[PDB]
Design an enzyme around this catalytic site. Structure first.
Site, PDB file in Angstrom:
ATOM      1  N   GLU A  87       3.548 -12.765 -21.001  1.00 38.16           N
ATOM      2  CA  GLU A  87       4.525 -13.833 -21.178  1.00 38.16           C
ATOM      3  C   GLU A  87       4.448 -14.557 -19.938  1.00 38.16           C
ATOM      4  O   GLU A  87       4.233 -14.224 -18.798  1.00 38.16           O
ATOM      5  CB  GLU A  87       5.950 -13.067 -21.538  1.00 38.16           C
ATOM      6  N   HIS A  88       4.555 -15.993 -20.135  1.00 39.39           N
ATOM      7  CA  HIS A  88       5.017 -16.756 -18.986  1.00 39.39           C
ATOM      8  C   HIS A  88       6.401 -16.824 -18.581  1.00 39.39           C
ATOM      9  O   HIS A  88       7.241 -17.098 -19.350  1.00 39.39           O
ATOM     10  CB  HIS A  88       4.646 -18.279 -19.191  1.00 39.39           C
ATOM     11  N   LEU A  89       6.905 -16.599 -17.155  1.00 39.38           N
ATOM     12  CA  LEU A  89       8.372 -16.565 -16.943  1.00 39.38           C
ATOM     13  C   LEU A  89       8.250 -18.121 -15.904  1.00 39.38           C
ATOM     14  O   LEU A  89       7.518 -17.698 -14.728  1.00 39.38           O
ATOM     15  CB  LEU A  89       8.929 -15.527 -16.284  1.00 39.38           C
ATOM     16  N   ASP A 196       4.670  -1.141  -6.730  1.00 36.45           N
ATOM     17  CA  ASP A 196       3.878  -2.447  -6.051  1.00 36.45           C
ATOM     18  C   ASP A 196       5.035  -3.219  -5.565  1.00 36.45           C
ATOM     19  O   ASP A 196       4.749  -4.526  -5.590  1.00 36.45           O
ATOM     20  CB  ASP A 196       2.801  -2.842  -6.373  1.00 36.45           C
TER      21      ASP A 196
HETATM   22  N1  LIG Z   1       4.326 -13.802 -16.193  1.00 39.82           N
HETATM   23  C1  LIG Z   1       4.056 -14.772 -15.324  1.00 39.82           C
HETATM   24  N2  LIG Z   1       4.654 -16.085 -15.488  1.00 39.82           N
HETATM   25  C2  LIG Z   1       4.403 -16.837 -14.727  1.00 39.82           C
HETATM   26  N3  LIG Z   1       4.165 -16.898 -13.364  1.00 39.82           N
HETATM   27  C3  LIG Z   1       3.435 -15.520 -13.314  1.00 39.82           C
HETATM   28  C4  LIG Z   1       3.565 -14.467 -13.965  1.00 39.82           C
HETATM   29  N4  LIG Z   1       3.118 -13.464 -13.376  1.00 39.82           N
HETATM   30  C5  LIG Z   1       2.628 -13.818 -12.151  1.00 39.82           C
HETATM   31  N5  LIG Z   1       2.910 -15.162 -12.063  1.00 39.82           N
HETATM   32  C6  LIG Z   1       2.724 -15.775 -10.874  1.00 39.82           C
HETATM   33  O1  LIG Z   1       1.448 -15.855 -10.595  1.00 39.82           O
HETATM   34  C7  LIG Z   1       1.184 -15.016  -9.277  1.00 39.82           C
HETATM   35  C8  LIG Z   1       0.510 -13.839  -9.742  1.00 39.82           C
HETATM   36  O2  LIG Z   1       0.898 -12.510  -9.125  1.00 39.82           O
HETATM   37  P1  LIG Z   1       0.086 -11.186  -9.497  1.00 39.82           P
HETATM   38  O3  LIG Z   1      -0.042 -11.145 -10.895  1.00 39.82           O
HETATM   39  O4  LIG Z   1       1.079 -10.208  -9.156  1.00 39.82           O
HETATM   40  O5  LIG Z   1      -1.253 -11.255  -8.517  1.00 39.82           O
HETATM   41  P2  LIG Z   1      -2.706 -10.528  -8.815  1.00 39.82           P
HETATM   42  O6  LIG Z   1      -3.258 -11.417  -9.850  1.00 39.82           O
HETATM   43  O7  LIG Z   1      -2.698  -9.159  -9.377  1.00 39.82           O
HETATM   44  N6  LIG Z   1      -3.653 -10.480  -7.425  1.00 39.82           N
HETATM   45  P3  LIG Z   1      -2.520  -9.999  -6.216  1.00 39.82           P
HETATM   46  O8  LIG Z   1      -1.521 -10.948  -5.628  1.00 39.82           O
HETATM   47  O9  LIG Z   1      -3.636  -9.669  -4.934  1.00 39.82           O
HETATM   48  O10 LIG Z   1      -1.983  -8.580  -6.460  1.00 39.82           O
HETATM   49  C9  LIG Z   1       2.766 -14.614  -8.893  1.00 39.82           C
HETATM   50  O11 LIG Z   1       3.142 -14.934  -7.565  1.00 39.82           O
HETATM   51  C10 LIG Z   1       3.586 -15.448  -9.738  1.00 39.82           C
HETATM   52  O12 LIG Z   1       3.779 -16.799  -8.853  1.00 39.82           O
HETATM   53  O1  LIG Z   2      -1.683  -7.049  -2.725  1.00 33.29           O
HETATM   54  C1  LIG Z   2      -0.453  -6.779  -2.448  1.00 33.29           C
HETATM   55  C2  LIG Z   2       0.398  -7.012  -1.280  1.00 33.29           C
HETATM   56  N1  LIG Z   2       0.060  -7.117  -0.204  1.00 33.29           N
HETATM   57  C3  LIG Z   2      -1.173  -8.319  -0.181  1.00 33.29           C
HETATM   58  C4  LIG Z   2      -1.814  -8.550   1.198  1.00 33.29           C
HETATM   59  O2  LIG Z   2      -0.706  -8.902   2.122  1.00 33.29           O
HETATM   60  C5  LIG Z   2       0.523  -7.882   2.092  1.00 33.29           C
HETATM   61  C6  LIG Z   2       1.058  -7.631   0.787  1.00 33.29           C
HETATM   62  C7  LIG Z   2      -0.121  -5.476  -3.544  1.00 33.29           C
HETATM   63  O3  LIG Z   2      -0.225  -6.007  -4.918  1.00 33.29           O
HETATM   64  C8  LIG Z   2      -0.654  -4.287  -3.043  1.00 33.29           C
HETATM   65  O4  LIG Z   2       0.325  -3.584  -2.190  1.00 33.29           O
HETATM   66  C9  LIG Z   2      -1.868  -4.092  -2.978  1.00 33.29           C
HETATM   67  O5  LIG Z   2      -2.593  -5.162  -1.970  1.00 33.29           O
HETATM   68  C10 LIG Z   2      -2.694  -4.269  -4.136  1.00 33.29           C
HETATM   69  O6  LIG Z   2      -4.213  -4.164  -3.386  1.00 33.29           O
END
Ligand SMILES: Nc1ncnc2c1ncn2[C@@H]1O[C@H](COP(=O)(O)OP(=O)(O)NP(=O)(O)O)[C@@H](O)[C@H]1O
Ligand SMILES: O=C(CN1CCOCC1)[C@@H](O)[C@H](O)[C@H](O)CO
Ligand SMILES: Nc1ncnc2c1ncn2[C@@H]1O[C@H](COP(=O)(O)OP(=O)(O)NP(=O)(O)O)[C@@H](O)[C@H]1O
Ligand SMILES: O=C(CN1CCOCC1)[C@@H](O)[C@H](O)[C@H](O)CO
Lengths: 288, 290
Positions: A87-89, A196
């Site tokens: 889902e997009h938020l 996390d």
């Molecule tokens: N469901 C969602 N709907 C809309 N925007 C989203 C959503 N999930 C994440 N985002 C945006 O996209 C970013 C992605 O975050 P996230 O999924 O936590 O990163 P990741 O792909 O796992 N890589 P990392 O940041 O290193 O953990 C978030 O900061 C939000 O700004």
């Molecule tokens: O990446 C995360 C948060 N840290 C990213 C690097 O800048 C400091 C905050 C988390 O999603 C988690 O603690 C871990 O990095 C997943 O590898």
């Protein structure tokens, strides 16, 4: 903290953090049925990683206490890896909804005690990933055992494999002996954790706060807060509201170091030697 | 490709990309301010200020050429409790694609700028320490590029590997490789060229106006060194290299020097991220010795 320093140094009245990533590529798309958000990871373990996030999202959503994106699909990619659609938020960084999120996170942690929830061991029913790193969630009756074995030892074994770091090995052996004393004879109750809760994984819209990218398991409630504190970004009112519902148990400040240690070790493994100094320094502080 | 796969799996005709950067990475954080957007890097180690001052010096050297778009450095702040933050201009950016051939042109002009301009830097190195990632480099000026590179890039990386890993194979392969290096440079003129210094695909981007590059680790080196990391981790469109080599063609022996420069980056990755990079480092040395 950092944001007040920035406002002063830059002489700015406003300072709103942004709120894709170090792990997976992330992109929003409009579709015939509305918007979705898609994470892509090309590594071989992508599906395992995303299936853990699906499980985590479902566990949090079942509580009805916090808002998180609905998981939609995990798709294998030709050539390796996976995509995860959810889902997009529409979201902005956490600010006015900080104290409401503190309330919700404390209720979430308390749910296993007060809801119709019966989980009396630490761990989780399926594998969840810390970033790229698969975690063991094998159920354990004793939290310090679970955390020492399936969190700290797992990270330090990877450090030993990849960096063969003598100081890390030698400090860990001494720290292992101290760990039970940090728990002050307390009876720890399993708490469902987001897992996390970095400031980059929480946000808000007009309805209230939102949290995402979980790596969930049943742990000590306090572990949740360590990453929130160590990388900042949560307003004070978040912690005020939370600790009104769950006061700090004796030895909280020392356990905070132990839980922050885990996150430093995880950053050492994901992001390299820049995180060696705080990992070792935290161990030395615990051993002083 | 992946977007067709999404249309099929979701059963949707449309799949229109939209949206903003988000929270982001260990890289830093972006903020909206009164004067416009900024990006902030934070590092709490005692050497953080030295690192960021190197980046500011690199950004300033690149900005002085007027040839490439880089974020403007704004401030370096000492942090209570140790370390520092580095504030720079925020740029709305997307991955390099449509602007790849333009960036190839700019990067070639950048490398030609020192030789062709008025004030001529006649040695290899730099006036201050710069970090490729987290490890500080020695930039002591040297007249001879193979000397500079062997001593202050390859030997520095291998000394760290010896200190931290005591790796027998790396040690013995370096004893053999070191003497072979001049063969890759004989009969060629090498002129100091101002380098971005860390031009992998994750440090370049674009917006509506043109390409952007950032996170430099600059020094005056052999122009070809720039391309090693770009090639070895991929992510640049072919048109980047086509445009670049229209202005600076591959000199004789390019592919073998390319291995040497890729070796440096593999050694740097081993020192940053551990033994996952031992295999490519040693194998690259073996290729160079065959
Ligand atoms: N469901 C969602 N709907 C809309 N925007 C989203 C959503 N999930 C994440 N985002 C945006 O996209 C970013 C992605 O975050 P996230 O999924 O936590 O990163 P990741 O792909 O796992 N890589 P990392 O940041 O290193 O953990 C978030 O900061 C939000 O700004
Ligand atoms: O990446 C995360 C948060 N840290 C990213 C690097 O800048 C400091 C905050 C988390 O999603 C988690 O603690 C871990 O990095 C997943 O590898
Ligand atoms: N000027 C900028 N404006 C906006 N976003 C930026 C800017 N500079 C960098 N970024 C973003 O931040 C990411 C990392 O920038 P970079 O300069 O490479 O940080 P870094 O601290 O050196 N990475 P690391 O080696 O892991 O610590 C980029 O991929 C962009 O998404
Ligand atoms: O991080 C960098 C590039 N590598 C990251 C891991 O995937 C391959 C590309 C650069 O900033 C630099 O060349 C060095 O890695 C230290 O950071």
């Amino acid at each position: 903290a950092m944001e007040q320093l920035l406002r002063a140094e830059l002489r700015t009245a406003t300072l709103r953090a942004f709120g894709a990533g170090c792990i997976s590529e992330g992109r929003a798309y409009d579709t015939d049925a509305g918007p979705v958000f898609v994470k892509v990871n090309r590594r071989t373990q992508a599906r395992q990683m995303f299936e853990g996030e699906v499980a985590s999202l479902e566990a949090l959503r079942s509580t009805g206490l916090v808002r998180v994106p609905r998981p939609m699909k995990v798709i294998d990619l030709p050539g390796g890896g996976a995509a995860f659609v959810m889902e997009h938020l529409k979201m902005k960084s956490l600010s006015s909804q900080a104290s409401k999120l503190g309330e919700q996170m404390a209720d979430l942690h308390l749910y296993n005690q007060k809801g119709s929830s019966y989980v009396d061991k630490f761990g989780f029913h399926t594998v969840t990933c810390c970033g790229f790193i698969p975690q063991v969630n094998e159920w354990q009756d004793d939290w310090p055992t679970f955390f020492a074995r399936h969190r700290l030892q797992a990270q330090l074994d990877l450090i030993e494999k990849d960096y063969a770091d003598r100081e890390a090995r030698e400090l860990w052996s001494r720290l292992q002996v101290k760990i039970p004393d940090l728990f002050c004879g307390l009876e720890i109750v399993p708490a469902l954790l987001h897992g996390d809760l970095w400031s980059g994984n929480v946000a808000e819209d007009d309805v209230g706060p939102i949290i995402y990218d979980p790596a969930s398991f049943y742990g000590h409630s306090e572990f949740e807060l360590a990453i929130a504190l160590m990388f900042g970004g949560f307003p004070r009112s978040f912690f005020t509201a939370y600790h009104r519902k769950i006061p700090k148990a004796p030895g909280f400040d020392q356990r905070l170091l132990l839980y922050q240690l885990f996150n430093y070790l995880n950053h050492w493994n994901h992001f390299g030697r820049e995180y060696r100094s705080p990992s070792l320094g935290t161990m030395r502080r615990l051993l002083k």
